[PDB]
Amino acid sequence: AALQSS
Amino acid sequence: AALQSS
Amino acid sequence: AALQSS
Amino acid sequence: AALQSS
Amino acid sequence: AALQSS
Amino acid sequence: AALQSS
Amino acid sequence: AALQSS
Amino acid sequence: AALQSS
Amino acid sequence: AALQSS
Amino acid sequence: AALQSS
Numbered sequence: 282a283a284l285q286s287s
Numbered sequence: 288a289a290l291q292s293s
Numbered sequence: 294a295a296l297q298s299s
Numbered sequence: 300a301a302l303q304s305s
Numbered sequence: 306a307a308l309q310s311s
Numbered sequence: 312a313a314l315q316s317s
Numbered sequence: 318a319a320l321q322s323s
Numbered sequence: 324a325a326l327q328s329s
Numbered sequence: 330a331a332l333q334s335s
Numbered sequence: 336a337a338l339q340s341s
Binding site: 288289290291293 | 306307308309310311
């Protein structure tokens, strides 16, 4: 699982 | 921003 | 923004 | 599962 | 920003 | 920012 | 699991 | 910033 | 598990 | 497990 916030 | 993985 | 995966 | 917010 | 993986 | 992995 | 906030 | 892994 | 905040 | 805050 990959979670990215920018 | 809210990111949730389960 | 709300992202949810289950 | 991949979650991305930008 | 809130990131949660379970 | 809050990052939680379990 | 990969969590990234920027 | 809060990072928690369990 | 990898957690990164910047 | 790898936790990085900058």
